């Protein structure tokens, strides 16, 4: 793929999301989603493999169904209200259909089945774009329509997403699949607070985006897609695996790392609304995510797995490409907890 074309496709993806987050007319929001899909599909297939084509096909089918359901919901809301504006939705059936469509776009369970497969199929960079940028538009749409959202459906989807993200990750030895299941769990965490306080969802999204950016950039730097390939990294770039361990501990939510603050604030807002059982179950279920994070850390940094003789060759050379934002992303992902009260800026 020609680099000019690649830049145009990426800018088209970003422009679709900007149209989603900028337009006050439902037709244009759906158009932005359509542009996002159209531009995204070739980006997922930058490196041509049968797995890349399969992942693109699955993603296209899922997003196409989501867009069709979304457009039907928009049409029904038009039929019953005559309003195109993104606002309170005046028909409960349209609200439910729109919620299902947006959840499917976000990969919230029980529409999660495509996330692990697509993430495994595509390369690490395409996975980064899929698991960080693509989440922005549907979350924006949900935040704008938060009041109309029936809390029961959103909460059930969030809890199921947390449970399934925790469960699936335990069984995975593929780094990309682990990241996909972690993304599912964190999306559940974000959508849990959507009915109550949207600023908490934005804060969780920002923290999750920083952590996933850091993790994916570290994986790209280490060029590892499996647990053993990452285990080999300690012999070559020990600093990389050490920072990976710290970021994993953050993703688990351990205090005092930055991963703790989104969970803490989400629990706070839910408790203020008398939700006590739900936050308790979510926090306990996060322990599965923590477990497979810890297993990855054991494999990578805390324990020294066997290397291969040919690694002595890679010792002599140095990494050619530098990802400029990786250090700052690590710092934000790990050491921003003393700075939570600044959560009033995005407010």
């Amino acid at each position: 793929m020609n680099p000019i074309i690649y830049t145009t496709l990426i800018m088209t993806v970003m422009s679709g999301t900007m149209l989603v987050m900028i337009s006050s007319h439902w037709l244009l929001i759906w158009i932005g989603f359509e542009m996002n899909l159209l531009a995204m599909i070739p980006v997922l297939m930058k490196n041509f493999n049968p797995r890349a084509t399969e992942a693109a096909t699955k993603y296209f089918l899922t997003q196409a169904t989501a867009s069709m359901m979304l457009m039907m919901a928009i049409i029904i809301n038009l039929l019953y209200s005559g309003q195109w504006t993104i606002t309170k939705m005046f028909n409960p059936v349209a609200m439910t259909m729109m919620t299902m469509a947006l959840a499917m776009k976000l990969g919230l369970s029980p529409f999660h089945f495509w996330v692990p497969e697509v993430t495994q199929g595509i390369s690490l960079q395409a996975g980064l774009l899929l698991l960080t940028w693509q989440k922005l538009a549907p979350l924006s749409v949900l935040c704008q329509i938060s009041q109309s959202i029936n809390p029961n459906l959103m909460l059930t989807m969030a809890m199921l997403s947390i449970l399934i993200g925790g469960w699936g990750g335990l069984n995975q030895t593929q780094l990309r699949k682990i990241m996909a299941y972690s993304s599912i769990a964190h999306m559940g965490w974000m959508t849990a607070v959507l009915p109550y306080n949207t600023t908490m969802t934005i804060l969780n999204l920002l923290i999750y985006i920083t952590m996933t950016l850091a993790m994916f950039m570290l994986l790209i730097h280490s060029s590892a897609t499996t647990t053993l390939s990452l285990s080999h990294t300690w012999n070559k770039m020990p600093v990389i695996t050490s920072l990976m361990m710290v970021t994993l501990l953050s993703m688990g939510g351990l205090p005092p790392l930055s991963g703790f603050m989104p969970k803490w604030m989400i629990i706070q807002e839910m408790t203020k609304n008398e939700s006590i059982i739900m936050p308790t179950l979510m926090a306990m279920t996060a322990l599965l995510n923590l477990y497979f994070y810890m297993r990855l850390a054991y494999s990578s940094s805390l324990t020294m797995f066997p290397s291969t003789n040919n690694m002595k060759m890679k010792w002599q050379f140095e990494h050619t490409k530098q990802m400029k934002l990786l250090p700052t992303m690590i710092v934000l992902s790990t050491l921003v907890l003393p700075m939570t009260p600044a959560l009033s800026s995005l407010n």
Binding site: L27, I31, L38, I41, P50, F60, T65, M72, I75, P116
Partner: protein, 98 residues
Amino acid sequence: MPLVYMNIIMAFAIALAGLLMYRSHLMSSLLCLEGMMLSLFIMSTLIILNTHFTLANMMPIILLVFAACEAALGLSLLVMVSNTYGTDYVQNLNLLQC
């Protein structure tokens, strides 16, 4: 709501169910996608014509513009799948799991 709205919503529901229940071929599912788009076009057109929303009579056209874009994307994927497996069968999209 008059019965025509019921019929068209039923058509969309049927097409959606057909899309969600594949049998073998991907082309049949893409046919269901195009069909759902037709239902949406007809529903939107009826709403806009009945309410005399003059400035929204173009919304059905844009919907179809992006319907054909989606169809084209679907066919562009289907050809590659067929090349890699020899058929458009859904069961060959099995390499990625979970």
